[model samples]
Target: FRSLVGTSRAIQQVRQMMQQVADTDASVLILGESGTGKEVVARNLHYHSKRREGPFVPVNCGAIPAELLESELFGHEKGAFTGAITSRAGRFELANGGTLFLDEIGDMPLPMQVKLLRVLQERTFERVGSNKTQNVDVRIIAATHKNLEKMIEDGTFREDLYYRLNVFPIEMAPLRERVEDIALLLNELISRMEHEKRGSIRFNSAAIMSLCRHDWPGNVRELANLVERLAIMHPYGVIGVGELPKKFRHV
Candidate 1:
């Protein structure tokens, strides 16, 4: 197993929680800001769990249309709709005996939430345009940056479903909250990029200090993009404070 690099209290707590829940079959709900690596934690949980060998399926709820999201999750029969050419298995069905990751689940529409609630309660669902109900034995792990509690108050989410999915909750800390891990993360990222022949890159101590001081409002994703840019622009090798973007340097 690849070890995660981090020494902060928040990450340590997250690691402990992952260990405690890895052997269980309960659904897990991961909450954190965007770019906080929620999916990373989900993958770790599934990989370390008893179901490690089983298929791990991940879906982005916000990326799919509300009208088609149901069919996507529960599948559809040929002619079930205009574009569904054949009997297709959905995420839940395909993930049977495995793990299903629903990323950005908070964006799932209310109607879809109702159907999801039914599936969670019965472990069964009928495909679109099919009356036959299919049984599924899949573990669910969901993640979202949005506040479900606020959405619930606004009547955009189901309270019962939220409770069901929240059986085991884990929150990933933002990069700023775990600044001490920046060096380790940067080294790992840069080393992998170089090994892959992506580009040659090196960060000076001053550059690292600048990164640590920044608020990192966009979190890891922003840092990753910046790193890639640095790799491409500074291919000669060292990335110093002078090489950093003006905004990053000043911020």
Candidate 2:
């Protein structure tokens, strides 16, 4: 959980949900804004599961181009295509008996979604240029920032695939919605920096107060970076409201 680190109800509920599904093999869909710790939850699930000893393969659906996604997921045989000089295993095979974290799944092409849905149902797939079917033992945990329901309505996402993935949904509250945890997050972020010998900065009550009122569009990830930046700019110094960046100075 890497210190799920917060006392707010939102964070506590997230922790409780993680604990409830930690040992199960159910497919989990984590819905949240970017940087809301979706991967953190996925990692915690994999770490606490019975398959902890197995590999945890993560694939960023949106980062990889559509043409290569199929081969990337199911691998390709030697001479599978123009650039297929050698055979290679894909993320699913690599994550055998483990968890596969599919990030930004909303960006997956419609065609790939069908293929993925097939694999999810059958647990077997043929490589890009192979006819033989190979069975897999991987568990799926998908996360996305987009609203899939709207995507489904707009025909960008598949309703059947959505149903397959939405079996056990966990929604992560945005940072602004969980403002009560800002102080704790500040402490944890600073402590982490100190432990890593990255220098440190203390935030006075005024500074913390200002941060508590911020919109935090980037969520905890933004907070973490801000702390790092402050430490670098004012190492071992105390930060008051006036010391904060102009944008964050809301007090």
- Tell me which residue pairs clash in candidate 2: none
Candidates' lDDT values, in order?
0.87, 0.91
Model 2 per-residue lDDT tens digits across residues 117-228: 9989999998999998999898899999999999999999999999998888999999999888889988998998999988989999989889999999999999999998
lDDT (tens digit, per residue) of candidate 1 on 136-226: 8888899999999999999998999999999999998889898898888787777778788888687888988898888888887788788
Residue-pair clashes per prediction, in order, are 0, 0
How high is the lDDT of residue 242 in model 1? Answer: 90
- C-alpha positional error of residue 242 in candidate 2 after TM-score superposition, expressed in Å: 1.4
Positional deviation of residue 197's Cα in model 2 after best superposition, in angstroms: 1.3
Off by over 4 Å in 1: 1-3
**Candidate 1: C-alpha lDDT:** 0.87
For residue 237, model 2's alpha carbon misses the true position, in angstroms, by 0.7
